[PDB]
Design an enzyme around this catalytic site. Sequence first.
Site, PDB file in Angstrom:
ATOM      1  N   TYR A  15       1.121  -0.847  -0.045  1.00 15.23           N
ATOM      2  CA  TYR A  15      -0.164   0.076   0.182  1.00 15.23           C
ATOM      3  C   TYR A  15       0.780   0.934   0.300  1.00 15.23           C
ATOM      4  CZ  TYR A  15      -3.539  -2.820   1.623  1.00 15.23           C
ATOM      5  OH  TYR A  15      -4.006  -4.271   1.103  1.00 15.23           O
ATOM      6  N   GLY A  16       2.215   0.812   0.252  1.00 19.50           N
ATOM      7  CA  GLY A  16       3.163   1.767  -0.178  1.00 19.50           C
ATOM      8  C   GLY A  16       4.448   1.494   1.032  1.00 19.50           C
ATOM      9  N   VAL A  18       6.521   2.273   4.788  1.00 15.97           N
ATOM     10  CA  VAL A  18       6.049   2.239   6.750  1.00 15.97           C
ATOM     11  C   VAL A  18       7.209   2.431   6.785  1.00 15.97           C
ATOM     12  CG1 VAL A  18       5.198   0.599   7.915  1.00 15.97           C
ATOM     13  CG2 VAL A  18       4.645   0.013   6.709  1.00 15.97           C
ATOM     14  N   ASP A 121      -4.174 -11.644   3.133  1.00 19.48           N
ATOM     15  CA  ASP A 121      -2.313 -11.238   2.994  1.00 19.48           C
ATOM     16  C   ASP A 121      -1.918 -11.740   3.636  1.00 19.48           C
ATOM     17  OD1 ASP A 121      -1.015 -11.491   0.740  1.00 19.48           O
ATOM     18  OD2 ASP A 121      -0.045  -9.477   1.391  1.00 19.48           O
TER      19      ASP A 121
HETATM   20  N1  4SP Z   1      12.563  -6.366   8.997  1.00 18.40           N
HETATM   21  S1  4SP Z   1      12.432  -5.716  10.125  1.00 18.40           S
HETATM   22  O1  4SP Z   1      12.660  -7.559  11.565  1.00 18.40           O
HETATM   23  O2  4SP Z   1      13.276  -5.385  10.414  1.00 18.40           O
HETATM   24  C1  4SP Z   1      11.200  -5.029  11.451  1.00 18.40           C
HETATM   25  C2  4SP Z   1       9.720  -5.239  10.787  1.00 18.40           C
HETATM   26  C3  4SP Z   1       9.218  -4.876  11.369  1.00 18.40           C
HETATM   27  C4  4SP Z   1       9.298  -3.570  12.226  1.00 18.40           C
HETATM   28  N2  4SP Z   1       8.507  -2.544  12.983  1.00 18.40           N
HETATM   29  C5  4SP Z   1       7.318  -3.097  12.146  1.00 18.40           C
HETATM   30  N3  4SP Z   1       6.911  -2.913  11.133  1.00 18.40           N
HETATM   31  C6  4SP Z   1       5.111  -2.575  10.300  1.00 18.40           C
HETATM   32  O3  4SP Z   1       5.477  -3.351   9.197  1.00 18.40           O
HETATM   33  C7  4SP Z   1       6.789  -4.010   8.598  1.00 18.40           C
HETATM   34  C8  4SP Z   1       5.353  -4.294   6.744  1.00 18.40           C
HETATM   35  C9  4SP Z   1       5.812  -3.398   5.767  1.00 18.40           C
HETATM   36  C10 4SP Z   1       3.713  -3.524   5.011  1.00 18.40           C
HETATM   37  C11 4SP Z   1       4.115  -5.080   4.332  1.00 18.40           C
HETATM   38  C12 4SP Z   1       5.486  -6.589   5.658  1.00 18.40           C
HETATM   39  C13 4SP Z   1       5.976  -5.578   6.382  1.00 18.40           C
HETATM   40  C14 4SP Z   1       4.728  -2.395  10.803  1.00 18.40           C
HETATM   41  N4  4SP Z   1       3.406  -2.085  10.654  1.00 18.40           N
HETATM   42  C15 4SP Z   1       2.513  -2.131  11.543  1.00 18.40           C
HETATM   43  N5  4SP Z   1       3.384  -2.202  12.705  1.00 18.40           N
HETATM   44  C16 4SP Z   1       4.866  -2.392  12.237  1.00 18.40           C
HETATM   45  N6  4SP Z   1       5.802  -2.694  13.294  1.00 18.40           N
HETATM   46  C17 4SP Z   1      10.831  -3.898  13.124  1.00 18.40           C
HETATM   47  C18 4SP Z   1      11.343  -4.272  12.757  1.00 18.40           C
END
Ligand code: 4SP
EC number: 2.7.11.22
Length: 290
Positions: A15-16, A18, A121
């Site tokens: 969706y874009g 994060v 998803d």
């Molecule tokens: N790679 S990683 O392990 O370094 C790491 C990963 C995610 C986060 N934190 C986190 N991430 C999100 O979206 C990650 C998301 C973006 C959209 C599709 C899937 C992936 C969130 N969405 C709500 N809250 C969220 N919090 C911290 C560290």
Amino acid sequence: MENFQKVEKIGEGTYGVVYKARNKLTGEVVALKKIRLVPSTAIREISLLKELNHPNIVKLLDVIHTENKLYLVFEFLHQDLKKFMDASALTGIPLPLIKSYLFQLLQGLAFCHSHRVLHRDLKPQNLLINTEGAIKLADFGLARAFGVPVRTYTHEVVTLWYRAPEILLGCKYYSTAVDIWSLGCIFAEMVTRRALFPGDSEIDQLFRIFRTLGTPDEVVWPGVTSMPDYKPSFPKWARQDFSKVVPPLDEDGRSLLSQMLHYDPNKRISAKAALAHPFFQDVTKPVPHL
Ligand SMILES: NS(=O)(=O)c1ccc(Nc2nc(OCC3CCCCC3)c3nc[nH]c3n2)cc1
């Protein structure tokens, strides 16, 4: 979103972008989703998510709508299931943890599903973990809300790997079981350390399912042959034993996964019923190291 200071790109979602972000006033640490187009139903759809609150569901904090751009502000977690899966690949994730996580995601699905909300998803990348042993579902309900495309705004391919067969066979109306199928694939994947079905087109994805589980027919899946993308020409593969699919997994575990992977979405066990499965008789909650 002048009330947020970007901290870093956490990743490109459907969706874009994060971002990890910091509330300049409140000090709070958050994940901020920019949504790329806004539209009425979507706003009403988002706004029902605000109330869909559960410990295993990443909290929707606020919905910000200005200058016709859209931003979603969520509670932030520090790691996703994939990076944890990577991190921990030399030895695999201890089975007691696998079980804990499966049980909590199931609790999550049971919640959303009883309110009629689907994820549609699920994948290691939206399953998010913390240091206290919790695992939570991220982006609940966003598919019905926005739509799903092929290429993300960044023309990263959306993965097919966790998609349910009835989706790929073109059923226009799916139910909650589509999330059970996904979670099932993620379970297998935790257990074995390799994606169960790494398809790289829809037919490759469908044909990898078929090869492991047998090409569906009217015996295993009443109604199948008359679904839109079903072709009587599909190569006719034999079903493999699950002792071979997910070897280290024990019987209660091969038994649960099986019912989460039933062809007929109708017979597929629901979250609620899975939670009651003998596999969870001994369930605990360990803390992952991190
Ligand atoms: N790679 S990683 O392990 O370094 C790491 C990963 C995610 C986060 N934190 C986190 N991430 C999100 O979206 C990650 C998301 C973006 C959209 C599709 C899937 C992936 C969130 N969405 C709500 N809250 C969220 N919090 C911290 C560290």
